[PDB]
Design a protein around this ligand. Structure first.
Ligand code: 34Z
Ligand code: 34Z
Lengths: 498, 498
């Protein structure tokens, strides 16, 4: 295998004086050699404080040169980084670190108060005490490089109840990186300038963006806070070659690009990648119109990384498997061998091979639901298009079944979201009748505007929606319950209105 | 890990009806699904005949759809293919199969007589008895897929005394393929049409060309016999996207392209790759002038596959390490830690990691000379250019040392090869004086022409060669002893003239 540490180590020998990390904000740059030296010193220092291989260390911080150093430091030492969204509640993080039987928690954030106070036996470490603006606090001699095994735990990332801790084995790193090469077209070389828009607590943010940038002997441009025009300036100033960004980021960037024109020079940008299954047609339309480079839509999971893709996508929902991947669509709640007839909907399952997680930390029931007989079960519904591509319909858990009929709220949400006066819409099935459940739309109006159940129904009737798909009821609301990091709490909304 | 068989298996699920193998000669095409079915049937059939996993099977055949089937069949069964240049002597092949304690030999070639007659206990199998023009002889039920281990032997390839049998472990396949992606820029997709110019008994021919083509869900175009204009027609007719070819092939192709013009449409060709360390400037010049696509010079070995490269090369001798690779230049005949001062010549050594061979079959002395402390020793001399790239000088074994001075015959050969009237030149050091050895040129004249020691000396004196580098003596010959498959027997030549 080639571990993260090895990939970065090897890169450093090939390009020791090339720029690894650029923070144009802080006027900060570090070469590959310089980035190693800090990874080594922060490593030795943690090791001098008692930290040993295989011990789990929480990391809770916004993106920064300093957290990159700390994370690779931890990995280099041998410890297992558990990367947590800093947007979680104090209560939630404290609980996850408690449940994770974690040895320490590297933080930058009162959240510190909470950890102490949860009972958890985790030594609270402030990121600024380890490294500041790329400058580490050094003490102790250099340390061993511990032996790493292919199935051994390497990194922990959390899913989208509470988030589950997916364990990423050592042998997963390489294909978690190289799919950026086989699917997206990135190649080895110092031409590589990669914009760090994706957060580091997400597997794409970490493997596909940070580690890929360094392992191809390129440069990772750190972004602490996303501002659309600022980011487009970075593309121009840094000669950015690729960006991987969220649907929301791209909408921002496309419109700023449009309301710029050839004001900004974006020619260096050859790759614009995104997980755009949930991306509305209109945004995608603006992406092709107003941003340069080859566009690649990508489908993946925390659990198995990349499973599908499309170069130059027409819709955001249909994609095909790439290198490393093997995929099936099976009857919902059936065995991994129950393939569906072509054109019938089912669950997307992907082979659980090198890139796959080895289980959810301390949750073997969840694991046995998800890893069956060598497959990973996405919980996503899909259909095989006549063109031989996979169309993603929505989550199994959001699927409304009304009068014995599969209805996917995301479809309806895409239609309703275009209705004049609508700012947000979530479609849910109410425990009810006609039967099983009834299609219900919950809609927030634009600032100042009214909405009408009647007018929205009229709008739907003029749309493409098949009859049975149309909402039977409308609730107009000032707000949707969003404390799963935005993400709507579909379950909790149902409770609120029923 | 992802083994050859797995890479091809997975591809077949993603692209079952896409064309895997095209033989435009025989008007033959096979989809990925169809190629699996024959691999399975030839597998079961060999297994029904007694063949078991880990048993070594010799393969001696020119390139063809049929040998591709047989080789993958053997691999799929579990047997270990030992691929041998069909241009070797009957005596030599019989001896290698004897030494290789090989269970059977799949052949297409009197060579059959010799094997029987060498004592060797190897069941002689004619390729036409297993599969004919893509059509296999089937019998027996389908068979198990045997368990494969990362360090377990997978394939045997022979070096350039007699050829040594380098054992290629299961875990080597992936990076032996994916360097075509990280260095050369190939990406996954059915756009991939790969021209099979390289022979299948060479690791590039096999991993970088055949397996890469199929594993990226593309098409391998079979070429039984290389004809320059024919091959350029194939590019046009088949929409070839990449070719990997020898220096000799490219010279042919460039001149045929030139003596064609836009007669031939070559636009589909995006990648022209070559191992061009020994490639003369003039040929390279014609390659950039007359062939399209990005040109990539690549350095590699049977033992460790790809170790260096250059996009858009200016000379053929200077290259830089890519993804997977780690490299050093050490003092000749010294420890792997004896790095040289920058600008001093030494031996190129490359880290022995996933892609590396695990040893030479039945030759542990040779192995211990070659695999030391985690490195693979190339036996090639190199220098680090001030630009931070590796300049390959020539083999350690051809290096002439005259008056305590390193002289590389390939350099002198490149100069002398341009001298009017010279068809071939080999430079050797004669056991002699001034001292140690004396630089001697052996030159074959062009058909009908004379050569003069005096005129060649005059030519050299007008060249770039530093004084001490100039040949002290000239032997004009009608022929150079070439029975190491062309390749000159430098040792044997020395004997002839001394
Ligand atoms: O969380 C996701 O959507 C996700 C996770 C991993 C990958 Cl590779 C992708 Cl393309 C998407
Ligand atoms: O035999 C060679 O020259 C050779 C072997 C393997 C590779 Cl990858 C290359 Cl680029 C060249």
């Amino acid at each position: 295998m080639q571990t993260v540490n090895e990939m970065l180590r090897r890169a450093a020998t090939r390009a020791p004086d090339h720029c690894a990390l650029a923070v144009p904000a802080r006027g900060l740059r570090l070469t590959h050699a310089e980035l190693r030296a800090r990874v080594e010193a922060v490593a030795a220092r943690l090791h001098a404080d008692g930290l040993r291989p295989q011990q789990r260390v929480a990391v809770v911080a916004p993106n920064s040169a300093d957290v990159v150093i700390a994370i690779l430091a931890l990995h280099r030492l041998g410890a297992v980084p558990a990367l947590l969204n800093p947007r979680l509640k104090s209560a939630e993080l404290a609980e996850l670190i408690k449940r994770g039987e974690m040895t320490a928690a590297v933080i930058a954030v009162q959240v510190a108060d909470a950890i102490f106070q949860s009972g958890s036996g985790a030594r609270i470490i402030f990121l600024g005490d380890l490294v500041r603006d790329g400058e580490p606090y050094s003490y102790g001699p250099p340390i061993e490089d511990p032996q790493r095994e292919p199935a051994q735990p390497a990194f922990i990332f959390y899913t989208s109840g509470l988030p589950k801790a997916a364990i990423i084995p050592q042998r997963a790193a390489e294909s978690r990186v190289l799919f950026m090469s086989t699917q997206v077209g990135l190649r080895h070389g110092r031409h590589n300038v990669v914009l760090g828009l994706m957060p580091l607590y997400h597997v794409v943010g970490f493997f596909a963006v940070l580690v890929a940038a360094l392992a191809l002997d390129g440069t990772y441009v750190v972004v602490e806070e996303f501002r659309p025009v600022d980011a487009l300036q970075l593309v121009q100033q840094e000669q950015v070659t690729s960006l991987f960004a969220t649907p929301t980021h791209l909408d921002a960037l496309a419109a700023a690009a449009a309301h710029a024109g050839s004001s900004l020079k974006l020619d260096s940008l050859r790759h614009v990648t995104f997980a755009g299954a949930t991306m509305p047609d209109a945004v995608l339309e603006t992406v092709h119109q107003h941003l340069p480079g080859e566009k690649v839509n990508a489908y993946g999971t925390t659990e198995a990384m990349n499973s599908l893709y499309m170069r130059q996508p027409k819709t955001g929902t249909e994609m095909a498997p790439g290198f490393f991947s093997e995929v099936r669509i099976v009857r919902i709640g059936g065995g991994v061998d129950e393939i569906v007839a072509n054109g019938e909907e089912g669950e997307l399952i992907v082979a659980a091979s090198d890139s796959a997680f080895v289980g959810y930390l301390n949750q073997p029931q969840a694991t046995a639901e998800k890893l069956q007989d060598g497959w990973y079960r996405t919980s996503d519904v899909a259909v095989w298009t006549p063109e031989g591509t996979v169309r993603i319909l929505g989550r199994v858990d959001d699927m409304i079944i009304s009068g014995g009929e599969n209805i996917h709220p995301s479809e309806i949400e895409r239609v309703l979201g275009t209705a004049p006066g609508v700012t947000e819409v979530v479609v849910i099935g109410l425990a009810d009748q006609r039967w099983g459940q009834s299609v219900t739309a919950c809609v927030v109006p634009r600032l100042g505007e009214t909405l009408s159940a009647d007018a929205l129904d009229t709008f739907c009737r003029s749309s493409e929606l098949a009859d049975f798909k149309r909402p039977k009821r409308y609730f107009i609301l000032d707000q949707l319950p969003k404390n799963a990091l935005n993400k709507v709490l579909r379950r909790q909304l149902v409770q609120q209105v029923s």
